[PDB]
Every structure is written in structure tokens, then in C-alpha cells.
Amino acid sequence: SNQARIDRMNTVTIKGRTPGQKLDRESVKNDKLVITVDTVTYASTVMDWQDDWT
Amino acid sequence: SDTPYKADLSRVHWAGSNSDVDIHLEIFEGDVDSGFMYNSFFRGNSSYVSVQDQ
């Protein structure tokens, strides 16, 4: 392939309570990351036979 | 917020109607706090004379 993936996630929070009260809930969050490969790098050289023989 | 039982709770060691007077028992280990200690430093820094019974 030509892609890679990684995941991300958030954190939580704390609260306080007193007798007779209910408890609240919270929601976590997440995302993702992706990286791609695009370009090739190279070097080249060429020589002629007549120059090679001399 | 409130649970559906808030007004009808049975609370032990709360007196009176509405159960809001605190009559709990204290817990006592035995700790006692008092002033700090000291020891004299100047007793050899003088000339001494005794006049006991004379």
C-alpha cells in the first residue's frame, strides 16, 4: 500500500457528589492520522563506448 | 439530578423529623497536643557558691 494510520483519544474529568444526587456522564473523543509516500529520488550517469575504449 | 428517592431516605444517626440533626459518635484514638520541650544551656558559665544551712 502507500498509507499508514494511527489513532488518537481524549481524556476524562472528575466531579463531586452529595447524598440524594445523581451521577453525570461524559463523552470521550478520538481522531486519526495518515501519512503518504509521493516522490522518488535518483541519480544517473551515462558513458559512451568510444570514449570508454580510450 | 435528584434521584427518585431523595425525599424518602432512611438515614441512621440523624435525629428529629426530616432526619437532618447530627448525632453521630466520635472516634478517639488517644492523641494529645501540648507545648514543646526545652533544656537549659547555661549552668557552667558562672562561678558557684553554696550557702545551704549556713
CB A6 within 8 A of CB A32: yes
Distance from CA of B32 to the nearest CA of A (A): 32
Query: Which value in Å is the resolution of this experimental model?
Result: 3.0
Q: How far apart are CA A24 and CA A13, in angstroms?
A: 11
Experimental technique used? cryo-EM
E strand or H helix at A9: strand A3-9
- Chain B residues with a Cβ under 8 Å from any Cβ in chain A: 1-3, 5-6, 9
Backbone φ, ψ for residue A51 (5° rounding): -65, -35
Residue B52: all three cell numbers together: 545551704
Cα torsion at A34, A40, A41, A45 (round to 10°)? 170
Residue B43: all three cell numbers together: 549552668
Distance from CA of B28 to the nearest CA of A (A): 26
Backbone φ, ψ for residue B8 (5° rounding): -120, 45
Of the candidates B25, B27, B28, B2, the residue with the CA atom closest to the CA atom of residue B14? B25
Quick one: chain B helix, strand, coil %, rounded to 5? 5, 10, 85
